[PDB]
Amino acid sequence: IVKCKPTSAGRRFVVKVVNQELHKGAPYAPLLEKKSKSGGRNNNGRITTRHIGGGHKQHYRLVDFRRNKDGIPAIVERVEYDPNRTAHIALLKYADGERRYIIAPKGVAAGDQLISGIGAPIKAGNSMPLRNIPVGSTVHGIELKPGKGAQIARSAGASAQLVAREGAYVTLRLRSGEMRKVLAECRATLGEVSNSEHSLRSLGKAGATRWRGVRPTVRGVAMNPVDHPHGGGEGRTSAGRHPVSPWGLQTKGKKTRSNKRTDNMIVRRRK
Amino acid sequence: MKRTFQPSTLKRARVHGFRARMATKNGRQVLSRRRAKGRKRLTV
RNA sequence: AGGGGGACGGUUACCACGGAGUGAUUCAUGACUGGGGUGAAGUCGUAACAAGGUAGCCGUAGGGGAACCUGCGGCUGGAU
RNA sequence: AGAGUACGGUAGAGGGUGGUGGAAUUUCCUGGAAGGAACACCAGUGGCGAAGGCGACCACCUGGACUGAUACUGACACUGAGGUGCGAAAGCGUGGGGAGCAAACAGGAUUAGAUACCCUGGUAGUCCACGCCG
RNA sequence: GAUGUCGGCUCAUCACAUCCUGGGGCUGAAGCCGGUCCCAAGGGUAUGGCUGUUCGCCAUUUAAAGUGGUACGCGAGCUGG
RNA sequence: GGCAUGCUUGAGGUUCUAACUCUGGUCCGUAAUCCGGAUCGAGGACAGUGUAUGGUGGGCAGUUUGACUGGGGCGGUCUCC
RNA sequence: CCUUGUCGGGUAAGUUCCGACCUGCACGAAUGGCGUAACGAUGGCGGCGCUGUCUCCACCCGAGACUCAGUGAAAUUGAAAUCGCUGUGAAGAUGCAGUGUAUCCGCGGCUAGACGGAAAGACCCCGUGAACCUUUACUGUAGCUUUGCACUGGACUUUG
RNA sequence: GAAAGACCAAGGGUUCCUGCGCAACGUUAAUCGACGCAGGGUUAGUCGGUUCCUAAGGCGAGGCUGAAAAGCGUAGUCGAUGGGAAACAGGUUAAUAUUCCUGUACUUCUGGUUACUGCGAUGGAGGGACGGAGAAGGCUAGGCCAGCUUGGCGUUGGUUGUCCAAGUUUAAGGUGGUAGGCUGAAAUCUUAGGUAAAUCCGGGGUUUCAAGGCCGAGAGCUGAUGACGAGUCGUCUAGAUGACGAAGUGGUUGAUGCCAUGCUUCCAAGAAAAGCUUCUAAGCUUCAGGUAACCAGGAACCGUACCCCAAACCGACACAGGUGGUCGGGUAGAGAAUACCAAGGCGCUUGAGAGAACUCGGGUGAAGGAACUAGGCAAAAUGGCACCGUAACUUCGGGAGAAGGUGCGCCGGCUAGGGUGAAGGAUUUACUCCGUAAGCUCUGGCUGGUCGAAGAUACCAGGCCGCUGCGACUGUUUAUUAAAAACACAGCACUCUGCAAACACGAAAGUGGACGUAUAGGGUGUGACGCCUGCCCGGUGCCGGAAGGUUAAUUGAUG
């Protein structure tokens, strides 16, 4: 965390997060692949998510969310920057060549770690089935179907706390604040994700948004009646509607979950 | 002050060419209307 | 004849007064304001002095027409 | 002789880091699971530090005095404007936490009225790291 | 099946119910100045500060800073506040 | 009053697997992140879809929104004595 | 709004401006309130310098204008032998009436008229015209949602 | 003269060149033409394409989906604006030339023959293979300065010279391994991986060595005693051609070119695939296949003329417009600005007079100096470099080039260095160090003198200051009357969303969100920052709640 001096009117509010033990260039080439941008656009060519476009060219890193090698110890080579996410990634070298990327946990640099059916818990970074993880311990990178890979708690500094256990399932409080029953056959990694000071950085200037591939938001009271329901009016009007999307869905409080096929898996909502 | 027609023989043939017209059903009947009118070119 | 040497010249430094630009620092004044003092005291009031009718007081944040209340650490200049 | 040191020996909430605790209370739920905070007794007109200050248990890196003497120094002294650090808590920083209470308030009962003491509720805060206020 | 605003600028032209200059009557006109009413249209008849202004209010003039008509004269003359 | 309970039709609950579902693993078609098939796992008679139905619904749509009138609007008026 | 409120400053004089006052027709705290360095082809004021902006224009230099040679358009146009005045008149006349002027025809200029030319008025009214937007107009409807019955089973129980 | 010059892509289509022509076309005339008529003209293993490879994206056997048409898509196979062998100089014409000719190269393929001989995949590895910025340093191209080659000796004073003018050229390729740059290295022992295998790669363990190795711009040769380089001598018709033809060296300064796809640094974290290098599989008779060598032959097809800061393209036009990229000399200069010029190109296809008003684009202006006007609109002014000096306020960066001032040409006198270089000496006897010296070049400091009204003398080149409103800022907007206070924005908050996510496009499959996962994504509002953001939950929305009343299809008691 550094705070830039105001030598120009754009650096006045740039709070920058710089890690000096991140690796200095040349990511691990046999484990990257090509990734082109969508612009938020369908296979019908239609903008289906707005405010997406531009940015920097990026390569996709084949980060392992499954952590399948069991019993084979992996040493950590280096922690790298990943353009595709807000977390860091750690290059692991298994005991038989076999480089892979995982999501880096907090406190890793050249440490040892092994995902298995019964690995050491003290080391944060060991992937493990949710049956034999001790209750009360903070985990991240939780699978949600066995074999599917990690899906939950994998942003920067994200974690979930394993709170209870019964039957074939296991209950864990999520970072969202909601209690979620998850199957105990599926894996999780002990610890907490690495780049937890990511919420401190300030972008500073409008260009810093534009090179993350994010594109400006016209707010709907600035549009015409044909463009948005927040219509027009003379002067600054205030959306005489109730506040609503550009497609007419109400936005300030209205619930939009309608899944029903996974409601029993959610033991308590965001409270 | 550039104008609306900026010529390109590659873009002309991939939008209006013969393979393009006969690739799709709606353009495959452009070529039959334009042949029923008796035109000299039918792909321009 | 002239020379030496003077005198008025020529212009070179020095400088008072004057000029210009931009600042300092002081003095008077200034619509309008904010407290202070002395009065006379009309007024909501009872805030302190008894265990002053909710014990006072001090620092400080915080909050409220007012003479005023809670908290955190503080003191009896606190008494049965 | 004043002042200092070489030698142990205890006494001591010195102070800080990390943990390990317990009951309540609180919050859940079918007696367990969960985490915050101050640690009844030992508590003392007791210790300790220049001062401010400071108590469960545990190690770990560290202070100054006392005293028992034995050694040596040879006034090296005290005080000290300026100068320089260091100073309770509410704070407001710059990041987190989260129980009870509670600054901020809403009403409840009360009075000419509560804006009060009483009654039902809760964020800032105390906690942590660096830093500022002094 | 179009007669395109207000004001300024430029250029005017006519009226007289006269602002100045010229001739007079009456006066509660001593004189200096005036008041009021006749006669008289020859020539003259501001400049600026404010405001988009017409006006107006002000500063300083002048012998005097007149009142009206002319598509509230004038945009195939200008400007465009 | 009713007794035990067989034979059974209505609303619960959690459960069972075999419908269904899986944008999970693994095989095979296959030299394929499609797709089927096989199997393992998960959910499970739920979800989801068809059909019938209540509710919401300017997201979208077809429209309506009178006449009189000393121009139009505002107001008044509109039939009968 | 009243309104150029009132007072102070700036000017010789200031409806603007600055600073105030509070009598806020009709400010107000994320349709954010009040400040704010830097920034601005931003709005309003004031000063220095500078000047043809102006008093008030003078001269000059090039390109048109004018003339000669060659080429050669346009809008418009019922027809024209196409004056002023004062009346009249579908109510502002080259054309009527009365009357004054006035030989015939170009060229250069200037634009007062020809209610000059250009666009079947844009304002306004009209039309049981249109379009597009709005909603708490009417009638619907996509989407979302509720239940019945299908796909859809057994097995005990709480239960009638 | 950073083009009004030379080129390339695109686009056009014969506009190119020559002979004959002038009706029409050409804003006039035309003998001329981008016009008419007829002939001619475009030569490639190396330049561009095809062929090889892929990106976005398109199509898409089967397949999934949909009234139909069709949608989506896997295997696949299309699609360059990217990646993949390789040539340069001088000749030559009316018009083509890296294509023809000459000379010297290079690259790849095929058939041979000879020798010893593990070959082989579309599969595994390696490689190709890459961002932004910023700097040194090494070079070269280019430029500038002499001898004598060569010609000159001046219409007007001087000019046999310390004078004048022109020329002083030469490539790819070989060879060298030159600065510099990256990096340890092989010998062996084995191995849960690179979906089978592997001698390759990856992982783990052992042996010694200071130098391996991989890349890499620059000279001299001789490529090259070659080619190029005024004109004579005579022939033929002032004018072509055959023969001959001279110097060709050195020191300076150098790039925006090359080393360099190098180094340093920063986050926004920076194409794929093939050719290539290598490994084995299924296979082979272990002939075929492989690897060198020698010999012999081959490299198809298509484009090539001309125009491109345009009269040949886009603009109805021989139209002040537009149009991607490349090169870039001299003096002044920071410069690719600008002025004047070189190479090169051009006089813009109506002219001639005349010298009114008025109109346009300028020049100077007495005395005033914003009195103009809606408004300093416009014009005038300021303008460079070095040094001095510089306020409020500030978010400590700024404001600031604030404001204001001084110096400035040319000629000498004196003086401080810096870079290059070598008369010869150290040795690694050479693509090297030390340092002679001069020469050449760059930047000072102090002192005079001198001329004009004036020395950043032209072109070029900020006007400044004081109160204020609004928006924080860079940015964006009504192509064609509005550039703003509007929009965007960083920051802020609210709300939804547990992943087959909310959401969006789709009768649907599917896709986007996202190969992301609550520090994330969508939506709404505010709009840096500082101080803050009061009261109201009735209405309407949303969130939660008992469980009562009313309520739909369905059911079908009873009459």
mmCIF file of N, CA, C and O (backbone and C1' of nucleotides) in Angstrom, chain A residues 12 33-34 38 42 48 58 60-61 96 98-99 151 154-155 196 209 219 221 228 230 251-252 256-257 270, chain H residues 56 192-193 202-203 269-270 395 487-488 490 494 496-500 502 511 513 515-518 524-525:
data_model
loop_
_atom_site.group_PDB
_atom_site.id
_atom_site.type_symbol
_atom_site.label_atom_id
_atom_site.label_comp_id
_atom_site.label_asym_id
_atom_site.label_seq_id
_atom_site.Cartn_x
_atom_site.Cartn_y
_atom_site.Cartn_z
ATOM 1 N N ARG A 12 -3.426 12.559 -7.715
ATOM 2 C CA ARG A 12 -3.803 13.140 -6.429
ATOM 3 C C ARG A 12 -4.482 12.125 -5.521
ATOM 4 O O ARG A 12 -4.309 12.183 -4.301
ATOM 5 N N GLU A 33 -3.225 -19.821 -21.600
ATOM 6 C CA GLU A 33 -3.860 -19.958 -22.900
ATOM 7 C C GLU A 33 -4.477 -18.635 -23.324
ATOM 8 O O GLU A 33 -4.590 -17.693 -22.543
ATOM 9 N N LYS A 34 -4.858 -18.578 -24.594
ATOM 10 C CA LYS A 34 -5.295 -17.344 -25.224
ATOM 11 C C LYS A 34 -6.698 -16.990 -24.758
ATOM 12 O O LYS A 34 -7.548 -17.864 -24.582
ATOM 13 N N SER A 38 -14.892 -10.056 -24.957
ATOM 14 C CA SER A 38 -16.217 -10.110 -25.539
ATOM 15 C C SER A 38 -16.804 -8.739 -25.811
ATOM 16 O O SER A 38 -17.552 -8.589 -26.778
ATOM 17 N N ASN A 42 -22.980 -11.046 -26.738
ATOM 18 C CA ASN A 42 -23.567 -12.356 -26.941
ATOM 19 C C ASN A 42 -22.972 -13.052 -28.166
ATOM 20 O O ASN A 42 -22.135 -12.507 -28.881
ATOM 21 N N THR A 48 -25.202 -7.785 -23.821
ATOM 22 C CA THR A 48 -26.018 -8.453 -22.830
ATOM 23 C C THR A 48 -25.577 -8.164 -21.412
ATOM 24 O O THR A 48 -26.377 -8.316 -20.493
ATOM 25 N N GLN A 58 -4.957 -9.812 -22.175
ATOM 26 C CA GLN A 58 -4.744 -10.723 -21.063
ATOM 27 C C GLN A 58 -4.654 -12.157 -21.544
ATOM 28 O O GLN A 58 -5.320 -12.551 -22.500
ATOM 29 N N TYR A 60 -5.169 -16.151 -20.182
ATOM 30 C CA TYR A 60 -5.838 -16.902 -19.141
ATOM 31 C C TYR A 60 -4.848 -17.859 -18.505
ATOM 32 O O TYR A 60 -4.131 -18.571 -19.206
ATOM 33 N N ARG A 61 -4.814 -17.882 -17.178
ATOM 34 C CA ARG A 61 -3.971 -18.799 -16.423
ATOM 35 C C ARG A 61 -4.797 -20.012 -16.037
ATOM 36 O O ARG A 61 -5.909 -19.871 -15.525
ATOM 37 N N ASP A 96 6.796 -34.690 -8.823
ATOM 38 C CA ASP A 96 7.146 -35.306 -10.097
ATOM 39 C C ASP A 96 6.994 -34.267 -11.209
ATOM 40 O O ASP A 96 6.090 -34.361 -12.034
ATOM 41 N N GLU A 98 5.687 -31.334 -12.890
ATOM 42 C CA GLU A 98 4.249 -31.065 -12.774
ATOM 43 C C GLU A 98 3.965 -29.727 -12.083
ATOM 44 O O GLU A 98 3.572 -29.650 -10.924
ATOM 45 N N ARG A 99 4.259 -28.663 -12.808
ATOM 46 C CA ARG A 99 3.843 -27.347 -12.356
ATOM 47 C C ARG A 99 2.338 -27.204 -12.496
ATOM 48 O O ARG A 99 1.747 -27.712 -13.449
ATOM 49 N N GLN A 151 -15.555 -23.150 -6.207
ATOM 50 C CA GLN A 151 -16.454 -22.131 -6.719
ATOM 51 C C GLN A 151 -16.686 -21.013 -5.727
ATOM 52 O O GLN A 151 -16.901 -19.870 -6.120
ATOM 53 N N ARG A 154 -13.282 -17.390 -3.322
ATOM 54 C CA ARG A 154 -12.008 -17.410 -4.021
ATOM 55 C C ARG A 154 -11.580 -16.051 -4.569
ATOM 56 O O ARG A 154 -10.567 -15.985 -5.276
ATOM 57 N N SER A 155 -12.270 -14.962 -4.217
ATOM 58 C CA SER A 155 -11.775 -13.608 -4.447
ATOM 59 C C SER A 155 -10.670 -13.274 -3.462
ATOM 60 O O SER A 155 -10.358 -14.047 -2.563
ATOM 61 N N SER A 196 -5.502 -9.555 0.456
ATOM 62 C CA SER A 196 -6.617 -9.037 1.237
ATOM 63 C C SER A 196 -6.589 -7.526 1.415
ATOM 64 O O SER A 196 -7.532 -6.974 1.982
ATOM 65 N N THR A 209 -10.219 3.124 -14.565
ATOM 66 C CA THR A 209 -11.367 2.271 -14.823
ATOM 67 C C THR A 209 -11.329 1.733 -16.238
ATOM 68 O O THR A 209 -11.643 0.562 -16.475
ATOM 69 N N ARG A 219 -26.210 7.353 -16.048
ATOM 70 C CA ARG A 219 -27.264 6.971 -15.143
ATOM 71 C C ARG A 219 -28.604 7.397 -15.735
ATOM 72 O O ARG A 219 -28.692 8.335 -16.519
ATOM 73 N N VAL A 221 -31.422 8.778 -15.092
ATOM 74 C CA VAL A 221 -32.093 10.070 -15.065
ATOM 75 C C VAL A 221 -31.457 11.052 -16.033
ATOM 76 O O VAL A 221 -31.958 12.166 -16.193
ATOM 77 N N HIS A 228 -34.941 4.867 -21.052
ATOM 78 C CA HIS A 228 -34.907 4.407 -19.684
ATOM 79 C C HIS A 228 -36.253 4.729 -19.079
ATOM 80 O O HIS A 228 -36.933 5.640 -19.556
ATOM 81 N N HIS A 230 -36.500 6.036 -16.192
ATOM 82 C CA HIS A 230 -36.226 7.246 -15.373
ATOM 83 C C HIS A 230 -36.419 8.502 -16.223
ATOM 84 O O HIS A 230 -35.970 9.574 -15.798
ATOM 85 N N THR A 251 -35.384 -1.888 -8.122
ATOM 86 C CA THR A 251 -33.976 -2.085 -7.789
ATOM 87 C C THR A 251 -33.612 -1.810 -6.342
ATOM 88 O O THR A 251 -32.581 -2.295 -5.877
ATOM 89 N N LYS A 252 -34.395 -1.020 -5.623
ATOM 90 C CA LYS A 252 -34.017 -0.665 -4.264
ATOM 91 C C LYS A 252 -34.801 -1.479 -3.245
ATOM 92 O O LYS A 252 -35.603 -0.961 -2.473
ATOM 93 N N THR A 256 -34.748 -10.906 -5.966
ATOM 94 C CA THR A 256 -34.782 -11.505 -7.293
ATOM 95 C C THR A 256 -34.307 -12.950 -7.352
ATOM 96 O O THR A 256 -34.095 -13.459 -8.454
ATOM 97 N N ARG A 257 -34.151 -13.629 -6.223
ATOM 98 C CA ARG A 257 -33.829 -15.049 -6.243
ATOM 99 C C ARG A 257 -35.086 -15.859 -6.517
ATOM 100 O O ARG A 257 -36.117 -15.642 -5.878
ATOM 101 N N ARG A 270 -28.845 -13.981 4.005
ATOM 102 C CA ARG A 270 -27.989 -12.841 4.322
ATOM 103 C C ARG A 270 -28.667 -11.963 5.368
ATOM 104 O O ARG A 270 -29.624 -11.247 5.059
ATOM 105 P P A H 56 -10.291 -16.360 -32.550
ATOM 106 O "O5'" A H 56 -11.097 -15.027 -32.833
ATOM 107 C "C5'" A H 56 -11.014 -13.928 -31.949
ATOM 108 C "C4'" A H 56 -11.475 -12.673 -32.628
ATOM 109 C "C3'" A H 56 -12.850 -12.726 -33.250
ATOM 110 O "O3'" A H 56 -13.895 -12.526 -32.315
ATOM 111 C "C1'" A H 56 -11.329 -11.793 -34.789
ATOM 112 P P A H 192 8.762 -44.362 -10.642
ATOM 113 O "O5'" A H 192 7.499 -43.442 -10.950
ATOM 114 C "C5'" A H 192 6.993 -42.556 -9.956
ATOM 115 C "C4'" A H 192 5.490 -42.449 -10.015
ATOM 116 C "C3'" A H 192 4.949 -41.228 -10.763
ATOM 117 O "O3'" A H 192 3.790 -41.582 -11.517
ATOM 118 C "C1'" A H 192 4.116 -41.252 -8.545
ATOM 119 P P G H 193 3.759 -41.314 -13.100
ATOM 120 O "O5'" G H 193 3.781 -39.728 -13.215
ATOM 121 C "C5'" G H 193 2.582 -38.972 -13.150
ATOM 122 C "C4'" G H 193 2.801 -37.558 -13.622
ATOM 123 C "C3'" G H 193 2.781 -37.342 -15.126
ATOM 124 O "O3'" G H 193 1.476 -37.228 -15.656
ATOM 125 C "C1'" G H 193 4.675 -36.289 -14.225
ATOM 126 P P G H 202 14.193 -29.454 -18.959
ATOM 127 O "O5'" G H 202 13.150 -29.864 -17.834
ATOM 128 C "C5'" G H 202 11.972 -29.108 -17.621
ATOM 129 C "C4'" G H 202 10.996 -29.835 -16.735
ATOM 130 C "C3'" G H 202 11.511 -30.271 -15.381
ATOM 131 O "O3'" G H 202 11.599 -29.210 -14.452
ATOM 132 C "C1'" G H 202 10.301 -32.033 -16.337
ATOM 133 P P G H 203 12.871 -29.094 -13.484
ATOM 134 O "O5'" G H 203 12.630 -30.228 -12.398
ATOM 135 C "C5'" G H 203 11.460 -30.215 -11.600
ATOM 136 C "C4'" G H 203 11.345 -31.452 -10.749
ATOM 137 C "C3'" G H 203 12.572 -31.840 -9.953
ATOM 138 O "O3'" G H 203 12.774 -31.044 -8.800
ATOM 139 C "C1'" G H 203 11.661 -33.757 -10.957
ATOM 140 P P A H 269 -3.970 -6.375 -16.692
ATOM 141 O "O5'" A H 269 -2.560 -6.985 -17.079
ATOM 142 C "C5'" A H 269 -2.180 -7.192 -18.429
ATOM 143 C "C4'" A H 269 -0.821 -7.829 -18.520
ATOM 144 C "C3'" A H 269 -0.756 -9.286 -18.075
ATOM 145 O "O3'" A H 269 0.162 -10.004 -18.876
ATOM 146 C "C1'" A H 269 0.720 -8.002 -16.788
ATOM 147 P P G H 270 -0.377 -11.155 -19.832
ATOM 148 O "O5'" G H 270 -1.142 -10.328 -20.943
ATOM 149 C "C5'" G H 270 -1.028 -10.656 -22.309
ATOM 150 C "C4'" G H 270 -0.379 -9.542 -23.074
ATOM 151 C "C3'" G H 270 0.897 -9.924 -23.774
ATOM 152 O "O3'" G H 270 0.670 -10.606 -24.975
ATOM 153 C "C1'" G H 270 1.230 -7.905 -22.636
ATOM 154 P P U H 395 -4.867 23.203 2.288
ATOM 155 O "O5'" U H 395 -4.865 21.620 2.166
ATOM 156 C "C5'" U H 395 -3.648 20.912 1.981
ATOM 157 C "C4'" U H 395 -3.766 19.792 0.976
ATOM 158 C "C3'" U H 395 -2.846 19.911 -0.232
ATOM 159 O "O3'" U H 395 -2.420 18.609 -0.627
ATOM 160 C "C1'" U H 395 -5.080 19.816 -0.962
ATOM 161 P P C H 487 -25.403 15.797 -16.281
ATOM 162 O "O5'" C H 487 -25.190 14.351 -16.907
ATOM 163 C "C5'" C H 487 -25.691 13.999 -18.184
ATOM 164 C "C4'" C H 487 -24.653 13.291 -19.015
ATOM 165 C "C3'" C H 487 -23.574 12.530 -18.275
ATOM 166 O "O3'" C H 487 -23.999 11.264 -17.809
ATOM 167 C "C1'" C H 487 -22.591 13.799 -19.985
ATOM 168 P P A H 488 -23.371 10.649 -16.476
ATOM 169 O "O5'" A H 488 -21.897 10.238 -16.869
ATOM 170 C "C5'" A H 488 -21.615 9.215 -17.800
ATOM 171 C "C4'" A H 488 -20.147 9.221 -18.095
ATOM 172 C "C3'" A H 488 -19.259 9.082 -16.887
ATOM 173 O "O3'" A H 488 -19.081 7.738 -16.499
ATOM 174 C "C1'" A H 488 -18.510 10.889 -18.169
ATOM 175 P P A H 490 -14.977 5.947 -11.954
ATOM 176 O "O5'" A H 490 -13.941 5.666 -10.789
ATOM 177 C "C5'" A H 490 -12.550 5.781 -11.018
ATOM 178 C "C4'" A H 490 -11.928 6.730 -10.039
ATOM 179 C "C3'" A H 490 -12.418 6.618 -8.611
ATOM 180 O "O3'" A H 490 -11.719 5.614 -7.895
ATOM 181 C "C1'" A H 490 -12.395 8.892 -9.296
ATOM 182 P P C H 494 -24.818 1.738 2.838
ATOM 183 O "O5'" C H 494 -26.193 1.417 2.115
ATOM 184 C "C5'" C H 494 -27.304 2.285 2.234
ATOM 185 C "C4'" C H 494 -28.258 2.135 1.079
ATOM 186 C "C3'" C H 494 -28.632 0.724 0.690
ATOM 187 O "O3'" C H 494 -29.597 0.148 1.539
ATOM 188 C "C1'" C H 494 -28.154 1.965 -1.249
ATOM 189 P P C H 496 -31.309 -6.457 -0.600
ATOM 190 O "O5'" C H 496 -31.197 -7.277 -1.948
ATOM 191 C "C5'" C H 496 -32.307 -7.387 -2.809
ATOM 192 C "C4'" C H 496 -31.883 -7.752 -4.202
ATOM 193 C "C3'" C H 496 -31.107 -9.037 -4.334
ATOM 194 O "O3'" C H 496 -31.936 -10.178 -4.328
ATOM 195 C "C1'" C H 496 -30.062 -7.358 -5.606
ATOM 196 P P U H 497 -31.464 -11.474 -3.533
ATOM 197 O "O5'" U H 497 -30.306 -12.061 -4.436
ATOM 198 C "C5'" U H 497 -30.531 -12.458 -5.776
ATOM 199 C "C4'" U H 497 -29.228 -12.792 -6.437
ATOM 200 C "C3'" U H 497 -28.321 -13.667 -5.614
ATOM 201 O "O3'" U H 497 -28.679 -15.023 -5.662
ATOM 202 C "C1'" U H 497 -27.077 -11.883 -6.522
ATOM 203 P P G H 498 -28.518 -15.901 -4.351
ATOM 204 O "O5'" G H 498 -27.053 -16.472 -4.478
ATOM 205 C "C5'" G H 498 -26.777 -17.437 -5.472
ATOM 206 C "C4'" G H 498 -25.959 -18.571 -4.929
ATOM 207 C "C3'" G H 498 -26.626 -19.471 -3.893
ATOM 208 O "O3'" G H 498 -26.247 -20.818 -4.150
ATOM 209 C "C1'" G H 498 -24.590 -18.649 -3.051
ATOM 210 P P C H 499 -27.157 -21.751 -5.075
ATOM 211 O "O5'" C H 499 -26.460 -21.709 -6.501
ATOM 212 C "C5'" C H 499 -25.045 -21.756 -6.639
ATOM 213 C "C4'" C H 499 -24.626 -21.530 -8.069
ATOM 214 C "C3'" C H 499 -23.314 -22.179 -8.492
ATOM 215 O "O3'" C H 499 -23.426 -22.596 -9.842
ATOM 216 C "C1'" C H 499 -23.189 -19.844 -8.807
ATOM 217 P P A H 500 -23.258 -24.136 -10.219
ATOM 218 O "O5'" A H 500 -24.052 -24.257 -11.577
ATOM 219 C "C5'" A H 500 -23.575 -23.602 -12.742
ATOM 220 C "C4'" A H 500 -24.694 -23.021 -13.571
ATOM 221 C "C3'" A H 500 -25.607 -22.038 -12.851
ATOM 222 O "O3'" A H 500 -25.970 -20.974 -13.722
ATOM 223 C "C1'" A H 500 -26.876 -23.860 -13.674
ATOM 224 P P A H 502 -30.301 -16.362 -11.985
ATOM 225 O "O5'" A H 502 -30.524 -14.839 -11.601
ATOM 226 C "C5'" A H 502 -30.896 -14.470 -10.287
ATOM 227 C "C4'" A H 502 -30.534 -13.040 -9.988
ATOM 228 C "C3'" A H 502 -30.882 -12.017 -11.038
ATOM 229 O "O3'" A H 502 -32.257 -11.697 -11.057
ATOM 230 C "C1'" A H 502 -28.795 -11.516 -10.019
ATOM 231 P P U H 511 -23.275 -22.416 -24.235
ATOM 232 O "O5'" U H 511 -22.953 -20.873 -24.427
ATOM 233 C "C5'" U H 511 -22.563 -20.364 -25.689
ATOM 234 C "C4'" U H 511 -22.960 -18.923 -25.849
ATOM 235 C "C3'" U H 511 -22.439 -17.957 -24.810
ATOM 236 O "O3'" U H 511 -21.087 -17.602 -24.993
ATOM 237 C "C1'" U H 511 -24.707 -17.507 -25.246
ATOM 238 P P G H 513 -18.528 -12.550 -20.978
ATOM 239 O "O5'" G H 513 -19.293 -12.198 -19.636
ATOM 240 C "C5'" G H 513 -19.520 -10.852 -19.257
ATOM 241 C "C4'" G H 513 -20.464 -10.767 -18.088
ATOM 242 C "C3'" G H 513 -19.975 -11.377 -16.784
ATOM 243 O "O3'" G H 513 -19.203 -10.471 -16.026
ATOM 244 C "C1'" G H 513 -22.144 -12.165 -17.256
ATOM 245 P P C H 515 -13.823 -14.631 -19.237
ATOM 246 O "O5'" C H 515 -13.009 -15.981 -19.112
ATOM 247 C "C5'" C H 515 -12.557 -16.445 -17.852
ATOM 248 C "C4'" C H 515 -13.367 -17.617 -17.373
ATOM 249 C "C3'" C H 515 -12.745 -18.426 -16.258
ATOM 250 O "O3'" C H 515 -12.978 -17.845 -14.996
ATOM 251 C "C1'" C H 515 -13.566 -19.874 -17.935
ATOM 252 P P G H 516 -12.282 -18.418 -13.681
ATOM 253 O "O5'" G H 516 -12.401 -17.195 -12.684
ATOM 254 C "C5'" G H 516 -11.926 -15.913 -13.054
ATOM 255 C "C4'" G H 516 -12.929 -14.844 -12.723
ATOM 256 C "C3'" G H 516 -13.567 -14.914 -11.349
ATOM 257 O "O3'" G H 516 -12.767 -14.341 -10.337
ATOM 258 C "C1'" G H 516 -15.242 -14.634 -12.959
ATOM 259 P P U H 517 -12.748 -14.942 -8.852
ATOM 260 O "O5'" U H 517 -14.271 -15.093 -8.445
ATOM 261 C "C5'" U H 517 -15.032 -13.982 -7.988
ATOM 262 C "C4'" U H 517 -16.259 -14.404 -7.226
ATOM 263 C "C3'" U H 517 -15.975 -15.218 -5.966
ATOM 264 O "O3'" U H 517 -16.844 -14.838 -4.909
ATOM 265 C "C1'" U H 517 -17.427 -16.416 -7.377
ATOM 266 P P A H 518 -16.352 -15.020 -3.400
ATOM 267 O "O5'" A H 518 -16.818 -13.703 -2.666
ATOM 268 C "C5'" A H 518 -16.366 -12.424 -3.068
ATOM 269 C "C4'" A H 518 -17.316 -11.339 -2.635
ATOM 270 C "C3'" A H 518 -17.661 -11.280 -1.152
ATOM 271 O "O3'" A H 518 -17.871 -9.929 -0.778
ATOM 272 C "C1'" A H 518 -19.627 -11.557 -2.406
ATOM 273 P P U H 524 -29.255 1.463 -14.090
ATOM 274 O "O5'" U H 524 -29.615 2.071 -12.672
ATOM 275 C "C5'" U H 524 -30.956 2.363 -12.338
ATOM 276 C "C4'" U H 524 -31.094 2.864 -10.927
ATOM 277 C "C3'" U H 524 -30.491 4.216 -10.633
ATOM 278 O "O3'" U H 524 -31.252 5.304 -11.097
ATOM 279 C "C1'" U H 524 -29.891 2.735 -8.930
ATOM 280 P P G H 525 -30.515 6.433 -11.942
ATOM 281 O "O5'" G H 525 -30.027 7.502 -10.862
ATOM 282 C "C5'" G H 525 -30.924 8.126 -9.955
ATOM 283 C "C4'" G H 525 -30.300 8.374 -8.599
ATOM 284 C "C3'" G H 525 -29.177 9.385 -8.521
ATOM 285 O "O3'" G H 525 -29.626 10.722 -8.524
ATOM 286 C "C1'" G H 525 -28.607 7.486 -7.258
#
